[PDB]
Amino acid sequence: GHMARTVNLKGNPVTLVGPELKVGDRAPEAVVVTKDLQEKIVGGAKDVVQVIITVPSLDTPVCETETKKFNEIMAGMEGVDVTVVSMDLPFAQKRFCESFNIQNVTVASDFRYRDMEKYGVLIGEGALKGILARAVFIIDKEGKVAYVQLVPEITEEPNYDEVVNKVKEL
Amino acid sequence: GHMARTVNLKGNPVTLVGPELKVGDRAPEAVVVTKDLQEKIVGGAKDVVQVIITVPSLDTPVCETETKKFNEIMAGMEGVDVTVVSMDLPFAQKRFCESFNIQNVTVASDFRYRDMEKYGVLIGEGALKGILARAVFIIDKEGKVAYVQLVPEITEEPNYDEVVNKVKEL
């Protein structure tokens, strides 16, 4: 589960589109769109540690809960940029941020270029084909993947402490 | 009444991706996803008249107003299948239909294959690049485009009467 080419959806296997990203690989750059329709680049090397969180949709229960959690857990932490990315259009994401006070993390949409396929989390089969799997990536300042967590079951939340602890050592 | 290769967004023109469709052309089939995540084909020939309405996003003011309008005016009509298509994910469209009781028309997402590019309504530049322009197509039972309407200004509502009158003739 931690990292693989397949995940489960309600117990049924779902294959992901490659490539499978491994620790040590350069983090691909993803040109995503924020709620104000501006584009931003996640991935690559930055002067800060990056935490990229992918979710199927902010308009779904689990994803909503997860984003709220990371928004609270990463709050106040300096030296790190946290971005929750999904295929939701910026308009849905804007609505999400208006309904909930999200200010410790940035939500972004990958609808325009679908660059997250480069992270190996694009779902390749089933009802959710074309949507992103639930995963977490931590990128160091050298722009290398330092940590990967692919949640084995899409309907399940990730291990939050494993993520925070890795960010701390970086 | 006639398609074009550009539309305005607050007065400023934005180019559309081709091809430009014209009455008489075969209606391309678009494989879209409904709110229950089932795939549906719009376009092509069906034993019913098809009204395809494209909008930038149901999570925006005008599109919301437009969809509610068509839902009301198309209520009770037999022999016709009306579908509002956008790049919103099925999850957002699901939430839209739960907030406004939309039951006379169908809503579907073109996020998976982006087949509406085949209708010449995919926006190719500016802040809304990758989203669909506001338009209406009516397909006859033989699968041919019988009517087209491209709203000149994205922030404008379409001419509803013109659409209803043409559907009644088909």
Place this chain on the structure above:
Amino acid sequence: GHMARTVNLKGNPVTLVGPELKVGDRAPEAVVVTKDLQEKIVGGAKDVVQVIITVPSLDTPVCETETKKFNEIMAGMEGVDVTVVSMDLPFAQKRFCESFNIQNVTVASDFRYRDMEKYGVLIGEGALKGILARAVFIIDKEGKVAYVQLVPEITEEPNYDEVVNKVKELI
């Protein structure tokens, strides 16, 4: 035969992007581009039996051999429309036809819309990710998939006779 969600590339398994099609399913329409840059629609229901052959690239020995062989065995056959589809740009397909004198079958490119993903043959991993796997589909006049053959290994050629016999059976 039966379709599958995986194929081997030089012995190594690679997953395909869904959905997986089966005999009886409606054949999805694919808007492809011919060597003259015109668009052709394959799939759906037509008053003719359709044979859609997918290959990784006409610029590789195996695909060239497969295409020449199908061009030969389908020569002069009435009531059928055979199309070889790949992600090659039309410019490469044109050069191919010119060099191999392909006149009995049509070659077309899926580069513009990649509609063949709807047939479950888009490779989802490995060196050929984004390319089409080697397969054969036969669509009946009703627009239904009447036959399917997914070559288990990309470097291998398909079973030609099996296809020909089925086409004849469908008339």
Place this chain on the structure above:
Amino acid sequence: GHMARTVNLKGNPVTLVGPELKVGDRAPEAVVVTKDLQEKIVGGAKDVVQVIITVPSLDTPVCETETKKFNEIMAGMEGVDVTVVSMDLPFAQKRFCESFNIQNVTVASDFRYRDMEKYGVLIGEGALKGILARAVFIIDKEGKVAYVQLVPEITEEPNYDEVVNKVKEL
């Protein structure tokens, strides 16, 4: 060099997909595929000058002429990576390199992710919709666009000398 939102095909205008890149902008990264099927990253900041040359297809007369030409004037020039990019599959580019001794420039395909859309050269209408317009980009060591040249007539060769003179200044 000059950039625009349209190019002509035998004097007839064809619109390009946005965005328009300008000198001073950061050079977007494009994940392309070489003839050996390995992935290479063009754009972004590297320790060398980058010359990115986009063409409709190497399987066309003009494109072949231009490639051989650039492979001539950029010879022996150290500290500069030259890549010719197109939507041709790697297999055609491999065949191209085996037919013409090209050892001063690298050819790569953008078929997998179509990242060159980020450079504003993706054609959006007409018979060539989906392939790249003819252009030349020069990226400095800081990863910024330092030069841009969009050939006004896609069927013609670009202005070679001004490209080589600019790379020297860098």
